Amino acid sequence: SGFKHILVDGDTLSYHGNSGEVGCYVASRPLTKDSNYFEVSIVDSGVRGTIAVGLVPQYYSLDHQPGWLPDSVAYHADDGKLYNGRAKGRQFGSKCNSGDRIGCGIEPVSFDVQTAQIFFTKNGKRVGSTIMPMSPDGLFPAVGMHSLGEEVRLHLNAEL
Amino acid sequence: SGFKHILVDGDTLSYHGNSGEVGCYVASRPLTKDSNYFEVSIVDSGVRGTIAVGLVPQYYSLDHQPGWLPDSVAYHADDGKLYNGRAKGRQFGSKCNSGDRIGCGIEPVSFDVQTAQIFFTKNGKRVGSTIMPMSPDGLFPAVGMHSLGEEVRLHLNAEL
Numbered sequence: 001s002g003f004k005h006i007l008v009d010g011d012t013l014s015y016h017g018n019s020g021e022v023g024c025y026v027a028s029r030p031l032t033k034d035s036n037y038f039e040v041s042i043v044d045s046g047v048r049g050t051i052a053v054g055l056v057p058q059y060y061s062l063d064h065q066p067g068w069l070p071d072s073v074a075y076h077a078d079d080g081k082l083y084n085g086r087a088k089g090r091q092f093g094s095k096c097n098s099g100d101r102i103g104c105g106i107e108p109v110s111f112d113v114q115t116a117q118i119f120f121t122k123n124g125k126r127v128g129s130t131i132m133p134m135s136p137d138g139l140f141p142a143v144g145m146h147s148l149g150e151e152v153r154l155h156l157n158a159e160l
Numbered sequence: 161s162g163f164k165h166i167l168v169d170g171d172t173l174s175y176h177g178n179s180g181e182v183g184c185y186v187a188s189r190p191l192t193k194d195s196n197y198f199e200v201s202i203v204d205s206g207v208r209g210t211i212a213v214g215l216v217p218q219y220y221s222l223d224h225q226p227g228w229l230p231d232s233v234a235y236h237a238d239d240g241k242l243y244n245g246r247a248k249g250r251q252f253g254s255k256c257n258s259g260d261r262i263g264c265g266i267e268p269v270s271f272d273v274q275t276a277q278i279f280f281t282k283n284g285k286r287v288g289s290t291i292m293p294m295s296p297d298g299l300f301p302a303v304g305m306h307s308l309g310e311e312v313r314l315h316l317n318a319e320l
Contacts, residue, residue, distance in 0.1 A: 004288035059250050
């Protein structure tokens with residue numbers, strides 16, 4: 001789909017920007033009833049650990065963290081907060097660092113359109129969920145980065 | 161390969177169409193692992209600066225801008241947007257004008273078929289990338305033009 005300020009070497013995504021540049025990566029295919037979950041492993045939290053993991057609609061901005069703009073939702077590692085439309089997060093989970101993994105998926109049942117029940121996980125354990133007024137099958141896995149040294153591994157085949 | 165509504169004098173390509181005619185140029189050879197990058201220098205943005213630079217499959221339409229139709233991808237100078245299959249662009253980079261140069265290449269590593277990691281540059285600096293579900297070695301350098309006065313220089317031997 002597309003990415004800016006992020007180097008992609010296989011399943012490894014590394015921040016690659018200068019002074020205040022936000023890096024964003026959007027997967028090619030949306031989640032489905034079958035492949036309804038993905039995980040991101042933090043290899044290095046970098047200077048600020050500002051890694052964001054979530055779902056975004058098609059055509060989402062490539063220079064803004066997922067969750068910051070409308071119809072998108074994400075779990076941010078640096079504060080453990082859930083972002084879903086604005087740059088003000090909501091207390092959600094605990095902060096994540098190098099070694100932790102963040103997961104995001106859609107409840108199979110919601111794949112009956114008219115609503116998407118999205119859940120997040122930290123190291124395989126569910127943190128919390130949210131239901132979006134938007135329809136599923138139109139949500140794409142996305143990762144955001146914002147500081148030097150940040151690096152993760154994308155696992156589109158994650159289970160549990 | 162072929163071109164319409166574009167005059168070719170050596171490495172110089174100049175728009176040459178009347179009222180609303182789209183000019184398109186497709187190079188003879190596809191990019192390779194070795195020669196995996198090319199640049200286009202804008203000599204004159206013309207009336208609308210609607211110059212497009214990218215990769216297209218063989219047999220691509222000679223009267224549509226690269227990026228507008230399926231399995232093609234391009235960076236459009238007039239809006240800095242990335243087009244990859246439809247006539248609706250996606251925020252990508254900054255607009256380009258007379259004096260700027262646009263580059264496009266494929267990551268050497270992707271030349272292992274089954275996927276093409278395409279990157280774009282503006283004045284030698286990377287703007288962003290996208291991975292296409294299509295295979296490489298089947299992607300041809302292409303330039304599109306659409307307004308009077310538009311002129312560029314094709315640099316198939318560009319490096320960096």
